Design a protein around this ligand. Structure first.
Ligand code: NA
Length: 121
């Protein structure tokens, strides 16, 4: 149907926006702390601590299968990245502080993004 197709052109254009957002977000991680999932070989207790791990590559796989239906959903995933790190790591570590920085820098990118998704529909 033509109704289905138009919904599909909207998903596709959300997807194109979200990809840009994810490149922007991930430029605020020059160190690449958050680029890949935590290794269960190198932090074998990780899953006793963190119930829903997240990382930028896992968001990117989801994005390329157009698995994000709106910006809230993508935002939820970004926030897990931050919130998981801030839980597992102590306030005086380079990891915790790299998440605070990514949160504050990420907040701006997502602030305008939210206006573009409401504006362009
Ligand atoms: Na903690």
């Amino acid at each position: 149907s033509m109704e289905q197709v138009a919904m599909e052109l909207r998903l596709t254009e959300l997807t194109r926006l979200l990809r840009s957002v994810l490149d922007q977000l991930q430029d605020k991680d020059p160190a690449r702390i958050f680029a890949q999932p935590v290794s269960l070989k190198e932090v074998p207790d990780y899953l006793d601590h963190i119930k829903h791990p997240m990382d930028f590559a896992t968001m990117r796989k989801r994005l390329e299968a157009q698995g994000y239906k709106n910006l809230h959903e993508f935002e939820e995933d970004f926030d897990l990245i931050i919130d998981n790190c801030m839980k597992y790591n102590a306030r005086d570590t380079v990891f915790y502080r790299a998440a605070v920085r990514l949160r504050d820098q990420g907040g701006v990118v997502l602030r305008q993004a939210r206006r573009e998704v409401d504006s362009i529909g």
